[PDB]
């Protein structure tokens, strides 16, 4: 199996270490996950000490956070559009950490309507008081407003699905939002 | 596995073998004190040598 030690590498001076041991189980590795989209399949693998490890594959839906509001909703995943590590992962549409993908934006949309009562894109006493109190905060910025107009919203995967069985992430906002749309539009 | 039994002799042969004075002295000792073995004589000399090294390296100190 894939080793994880440095007894198989060269030393720092430029010296091939000798063959000293046989490979172990506490220096092993295993194959990548190559997690894809659609028809969720999760094989599990036994680890050191029981301690299960949900090897994600083919994951259709995942969790996504909006951090200024602290909320976290479930959504599908259109596909990855940018990955700093590899354009190969970009092409083959493989989810990993730090990965820039697009999501529906519709549960956030309808939740936004129910929570502030303020339109996007383009009655009862209690709900009216609620929206009137939460007003002066439906003024987020232009790029997210455009993305809610489009119905395809930029998120970053920040989980480790090959270690967790979870594509979890967060909507982009402000600074890194501008940075990543700059990287996409860079031509 | 059994912790090994210490063994150590209780005699020591002469450095220089054939000195007629030494040989006659230890023969004198064996034939007057009723001994069989220069081994035994060396043994007694070894005890004396042990205590003499101890005495020296103790009385060296203040």
């Amino acid at each position: 199996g894939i080793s994880r030690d440095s007894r198989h590498k060269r030393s720092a001076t430029g010296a091939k270490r000798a063959q000293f041991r046989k490979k172990r189980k506490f220096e092993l590795g295993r194959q990548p996950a190559n997690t894809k989209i659609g028809a969720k399949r999760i094989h599990s693998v036994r680890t050191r000490g029981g301690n299960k490890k949900y090897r994600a594959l083919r994951i259709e839906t995942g969790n996504f956070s909006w951090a200024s509001e602290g909320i976290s909703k479930k959504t599908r995943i259109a596909g990855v559009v940018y990955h700093p590590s590899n354009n190969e992962l970009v092409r083959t549409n493989t989810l990993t950490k730090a990965a820039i993908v697009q999501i529906d934006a519709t549960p956030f949309r309808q939740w936004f309507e129910a929570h502030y009562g303020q339109t996007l894109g383009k009655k009862s006493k209690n709900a009216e008081r609620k929206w009137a109190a939460r007003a002066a905060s439906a003024k987020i910025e232009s790029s997210v407003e455009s993305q809610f107009s489009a119905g395809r919203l930029y998120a970053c995967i920040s989980s480790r699905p090959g270690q967790s069985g979870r594509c979890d992430g967060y909507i982009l906002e402000g600074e890194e939002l501008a940075f990543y749309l700059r990287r996409l539009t860079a031509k | 596995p059994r912790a090994p039994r210490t063994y150590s002799k209780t005699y020591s042969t002469p450095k220089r073998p054939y000195e007629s004075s030494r040989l006659d002295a230890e023969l004198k000792l064996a034939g007057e004190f009723g001994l069989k073995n220069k081994k035994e004589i060396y043994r007694i000399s070894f005890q004396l040598s042990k205590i003499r090294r101890a005495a020296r390296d103790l009385l060296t100190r203040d």
Binding site: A12, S68, P84, F179 | -
Partner: protein, 142 residues
């Protein structure tokens, strides 16, 4: 050191959510930590726009264990240097010494700007790389 976001990824401090909605004084936030053992977090590290998560002060790489002092001899690498530990190994038989050196490499933050000859002390942190384990905390030359 022209651009903090030089790399394709977005380098930042994890979990330090600078909220874009509120516009309060000091528009962007920065985590840090006192390393301990009587060291100082420099004002350049406080005011810095850089990230360098492998730094002991602003980053997340705890110093613990041995501490050493040496003079720098290489600077030609990216956020990494090599020092020289000139010392004298004793030989009992001849009852006298001999010069020896061990060129340990260490990691260096952007909080210090170091040219060759700058004497430096470090701290044992976790394995930064195949070659590196230590990280610098004070410099003692010009």
């Amino acid at each position: 050191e022209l651009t903090v976001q030089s790399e394709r990824a977005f380098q930042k401090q994890p979990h330090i959510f600078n909220n874009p909605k509120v516009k309060t004084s000091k528009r962007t936030k920065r985590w840090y930590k006192n390393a301990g053992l009587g060291f100082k977090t420099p004002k350049t590290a406080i005011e810095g726009s850089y990230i360098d998560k492998k730094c002991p002060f602003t980053g997340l790489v705890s110093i613990r264990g041995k501490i050493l002092t040496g003079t720098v001899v290489s600077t030609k690498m990216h956020r990494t240097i090599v020092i020289r530990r000139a010392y004298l190994h004793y030989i009992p038989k001849y009852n006298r010494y001999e010069k020896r050196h061990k060129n340990v490499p260490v990691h260096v933050s952007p909080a210090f700007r170091v040219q060759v000859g700058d004497i430096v002390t470090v701290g044992q942190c976790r394995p930064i790389s195949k070659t590196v384990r230590f990280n610098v905390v004070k410099v003692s030359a010009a």
